[PDB]
Amino acid sequence: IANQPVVIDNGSGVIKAGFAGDQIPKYCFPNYVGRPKHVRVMAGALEGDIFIGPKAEEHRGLLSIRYPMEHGIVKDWNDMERIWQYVYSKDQLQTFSEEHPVLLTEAPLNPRKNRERAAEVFFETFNVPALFISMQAVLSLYATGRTTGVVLDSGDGVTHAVPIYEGFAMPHSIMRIDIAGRDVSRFLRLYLRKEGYDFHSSSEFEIVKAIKERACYLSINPQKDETLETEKAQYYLPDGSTIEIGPSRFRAPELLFRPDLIGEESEGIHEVLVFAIQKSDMDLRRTLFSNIVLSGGSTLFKGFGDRLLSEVKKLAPKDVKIRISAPQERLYSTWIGGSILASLDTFKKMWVSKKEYEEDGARSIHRKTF
């Protein structure tokens, strides 16, 4: 069918929907289902027992948030189908899944059952004309508009670094760590309890995320900011109450670059970037240092690029040019990439028809993936 493809970014945090014709994702809402906290047996209460996006925002205090996706993996498929049904609703986009094809953004190095089951849903639950899963790192390069470049995509669920040269992705140099934006929010909630502010409810977890997104700076020298007395910047809640964040503001995200401090067995965000480049051939290493691209939402932290550049410079070889070319629209880069890829005439060959899936089987999705 000639009808314009619908790009959907499968973000653990916020799902970004829209058509390949669109310059930006129009529809961006949190990737969770909101149910009432109290188990409602009686009538005259909140009906439907499903609140998605602005409906969840309206009844935020009343509902209980449960994310169906953890570290880019779907735990509850029934909830994810309802979310994808909300993508093809009257509220958002308002179009037939039978008419328009879809472009998905699956995380790298996921289990094969997760990929096969995800495809099954869009062919069995939804009667999609055509489906194509694409790599998040590759799409970012289409968005930026360069073939060569290292893509450090730090998301909410997963952080992964893929080195690609002249449109060739080295599968052996790819590194994936589960310590992402979601974990920093969990660690900040722990630090805020150490400041004396409890966030017991699942609804209060969103306010910890809101605090992080509003006020969270990465210090160049952590010892000087630790020694220096803080201003104790107050944050205002919807109710009107104030919270004094203080030193917890900057000493929380430190675990991204130093996860050994809390006691998490990982390399670190600056380490995974350097190692991923070191795996590549000696000829390309210099070109990869000179061409680094930041992607994902967990790069929007204040003074992120300044700290990262310093940490990479010390590990990287001496007298080498290190250029970290960050776009202004890092958060929305992945979807824009998908829109560009879908817009290309080459995509026409890339996607697999519903009829081909019915005849061939499940294996079809694996062979066409790359």
Ligand X SMILES: Nc1ncnc2c1ncn2[C@@H]1O[C@H](COP(=O)(O)OP(=O)(O)O)[C@@H](O)[C@H]1O
Binding site for ligand X (CB under 6 A): 9, 11-14, 155-157, 181, 185, 209, 212-213, 216, 296-298, 300-301, 331, 334
- Closest among 358, 354, 314, 336 to 141, alpha carbons compared: 336
- Closest among 276, 291, 334 to 17, alpha carbons compared: 334
Distance, CA of 359 to CA of 367 (rounded, Å): 15
Binding mask 75-104 vs other proteins (x if CB under 8 A, - otherwise)? ------------------------------
Number of residues that bind other proteins (CB under 8 A): 36
Residues 6, 292, 301, 315: is their CA dihedral positive or negative? positive
Of 91, 98, 124, 260, the one binding other proteins (CB under 8 A) is: 260
* Tally of helices (H runs) and strands (E runs) in the chain: 16, 17
265 touching other proteins, by CB under 8 A? yes
Select the binding partner of residue 254 from ligand X, other proteins, none (C-beta < 5 to 8 A, by kind): other proteins
Residue number, 258 or 286, with CB nearest to other proteins? 258
What letter would DSSP give residue 317?
Answer: P
Select the binding partner of residue 262 from ligand X, other proteins, none (C-beta < 5 to 8 A, by kind): other proteins
36 touching other proteins, by CB under 8 A? yes
195 touching other proteins, by CB under 8 A? yes
Shortest distance (Å) from residue 297 CB to ligand X? 2
Select the binding partner of residue 14 from ligand X, other proteins, none (C-beta < 5 to 8 A, by kind): ligand X
Do 139 and 334 meet the contact criterion of CB atoms below 8 Å apart? yes
Distance, CA of 161 to CA of 271 (rounded, Å): 10
Residue number, 331 or 352, with CB nearest to ligand X? 331
Distance, CA of 109 to CA of 171 (rounded, Å): 10
38 touching other proteins, by CB under 8 A? yes
Residue number, 9 or 254, with CB nearest to ligand X? 9
Neighbours of 132 (CB within 10 A): 20
Distance, CA of 19 to CA of 116 (rounded, Å): 24
Residue 152 pairs with which residues in a beta bridge?
161, 294
Residues in contact with other proteins by the rule CB under 8 A: 35-39, 41, 64, 109, 111-113, 172, 178, 190-191, 193-196, 198, 200-202, 222-223, 225-227, 251, 254, 260-265
